[PDB]
Amino acid sequence: GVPTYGAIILDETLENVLLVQGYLAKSGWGFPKGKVNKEEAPHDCAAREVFEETGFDIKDYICKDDYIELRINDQLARLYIIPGIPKDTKFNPKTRREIRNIEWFSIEKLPCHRNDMTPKSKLGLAPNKFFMAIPFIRPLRDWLSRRFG
């Protein structure tokens, strides 16, 4: 799969993260991110995708070594960590045909797994609107603990 790049934007308290809501297949909440173009450097793709989806330019704030990266179904997704962004920032997608809404969420309130359906003796996982974000939540919490504590 083609690698994706984006950002985990946190506010000044380190409590809240910025998620964006797409449409259809991307109908839930996730971190801003998208597919790398040919010959495009990871930091440039992250900044482009974030600016397209949020209207906020991270370019002056990217730290090269500060990211969480996951390989899901043999696609690589790397989110640069960008703390300290004020909660009163005006975010506006470029692209309202792609982005429904943009909100801050409390990190401690976000799920770090979906729930099973053990109550119903059925296999699988219950739907959760944070499905696209969830894989990153525990690594994010651990990364923040190590870096700040």
Ligand SMILES: C1CCCC(Nc2nnc(C3CC3)o2)CC1
């Ligand atoms: C809406 C705007 C665009 C970013 C999008 N990010 C995303 N994270 N996982 C996926 C699935 C394709 C694998 O997409 C979700 C939020």
